[PDB]
């Protein structure tokens, strides 16, 4: 298939009930990698951080791997759509796609 990027694990599609919590995560194998999260093709999730959306970054020393997490709580209709995860490397850029759905 396509060339290998910096995502060891690509984000996975998820389903969430009303008032629930949903977490999406991506692993990067190794300056530390920079991660951007998007709604649609050009909408930045980072500018949307607040009560309903949080970003968490962590590092695992043993495997030289960075864990990036997206935290969604008290999800509402407005958040339904397509989300794109972009992670950059020291010399490369990579892209992945996933969907968030919240009904009722």
């Amino acid at each position: 298939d396509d060339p290998i990027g910096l995502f060891v694990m690509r984000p996975q599609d998820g389903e969430v009930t009303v008032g629930g919590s949903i977490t999406f995560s991506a692993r990067v194998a190794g300056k530390p990698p920079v991660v951007k999260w998007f709604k649609g093709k050009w909408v930045d999730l980072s500018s949307k951080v607040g009560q309903h959306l949080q970003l968490h970054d962590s590092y695992d020393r043993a495997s030289k791997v960075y864990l990036f997490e997206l935290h969604i709580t008290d999800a509402q209709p407005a958040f339904t759509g397509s989300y794109r995860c972009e992670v950059s490397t020291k010399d490369k850029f990579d892209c992945s796609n996933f969907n968030l759905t919240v009904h009722e």
């Binding site: 050009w42 500018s47 009560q51």
Partner: protein, 370 residues
């Protein structure tokens, strides 16, 4: 058409463009239940917004959505806007474009997110972000002058000559009425009265609004305050206690004039205005001095213009007469400028549109406007 919202500290003023008075005036405070409880017969009412909060002020812990022209929490602001559009305006956001007024040299993030929420949260065909000094100039009805913009949040200076702005000449000042309120509460403690609560914080501000007046000369009144008789007045509080204030009330507004009491090296409002004029071109300086306009929440007190007039006349050359115009209802002047600004046909073409936002992105705000 335009819906006009003045986002100033403490009060949220909303209305319709072209109108001479805003439809909705309420505090911009959001109150939450500080104390936990278990009672049967309450809907709990976790979030309180508007004047309702003022009534239920003691239990509720007030939080200001906007600090120093910067919004700490975006969804609180949405509640404020939701409250303004439906509770008193009784109109739909869909019906008209919305005009928002923002202070000079404000951070990039505030304009981009504010437009982003307006395009996404409330669907409007177009929106525009305007600067408060320009709007005040239109309320004034004059094509040239120097504008003193001092709202509850931050004091700004923006000189103008026959239109055609001078960005370098625009200076931002860290002095404000809200700051005076903090100075005032700090000054009360030495006397023997202490207020450390947000709810009672407003009360000293209230005292300042009607019991405070501008001294023609600070040093002379302060000197005669030793033997005060007519300088002291009695104020009534919800607290159940009576407060008598003297030289303390007029020295609070003074800090705008004398930043030293606050603890800042920056010069006072009269010196800063002079500095703004010095920055400007020599040819346009002459009508700048006689065209000075005062606006905002803390410019309400009588005698401000009288003290400014002599101080500006003293520091400035005597070759030209110094006239300062400070008409009543100047508090709502910023809002008024917004309503007049949106009214003209040329302006409507200029509004940032939803189609443009989605196609190009948030970065277009700087590109389209100042």
């Amino acid at each position: 058409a335009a819906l006009v919202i003045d986002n100033g500290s403490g009060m949220c003023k909303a209305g319709f463009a072209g109108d001479d008075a805003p439809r909705a005036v309420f505090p911009s405070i959001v109150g939450r239940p500080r104390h936990q409880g278990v009672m049967v017969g309450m809907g709990q009412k976790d979030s309180y917004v508007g004047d309702e909060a003022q009534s239920k002020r003691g239990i509720l812990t007030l939080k200001y959505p906007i600090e120093h022209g910067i919004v700490t929490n975006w969804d609180d602001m949405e509640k404020i806007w939701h409250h303004t559009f439906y509770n008193e305006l009784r109109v739909a956001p869909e019906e008209h474009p919305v005009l928002l007024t923002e202070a000079p040299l404000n951070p990039k993030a505030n304009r981009e997110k504010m437009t982003q929420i307006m395009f996404e949260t409330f669907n409007t065909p177009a929106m525009y972000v305007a600067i408060q000094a320009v709007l005040s100039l239109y309320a004034s009805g004059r094509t040239t002058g120097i504008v003193m913009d001092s709202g509850d949040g931050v004091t700004h200076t923006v000189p103008i000559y026959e239109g055609y702005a001078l960005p370098h000449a625009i200076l931002r000042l860290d002095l404000a009425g809200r700051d005076l309120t903090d100075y005032l509460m700090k000054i009360l403690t030495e006397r023997g009265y202490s207020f450390t609560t947000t709810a009672e914080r407003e009360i000293v501000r209230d005292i300042k609004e009607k019991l405070c007046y501008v001294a023609l000369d600070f040093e002379q009144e302060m000197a005669t305050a030793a033997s005060s008789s007519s300088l002291e007045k009695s104020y009534e509080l919800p607290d159940g206690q009576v407060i008598t204030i003297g030289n303390e009330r007029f020295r609070c507004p003074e800090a705008l004039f004398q930043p030293s009491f606050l603890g800042m090296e920056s010069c006072g409002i009269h010196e800063t205005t002079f500095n703004s004029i010095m920055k400007c071109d020599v040819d346009i300086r002459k009508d700048l001095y006689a065209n000075t306009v005062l606006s905002g929440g803390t410019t309400m007190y009588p005698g401000i213009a009288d003290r400014m007039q002599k101080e500006i006349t003293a520091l400035a050359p005597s070759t030209m007469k110094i006239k300062i115009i400070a008409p009543p209802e100047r508090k709502y002047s910023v809002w008024i400028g917004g309503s007049i600004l949106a009214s003209l046909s040329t302006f409507q073409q200029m509004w940032i549109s939803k189609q443009e936002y989605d196609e190009s992105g948030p970065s277009i705000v700087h590109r389209k406007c100042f």
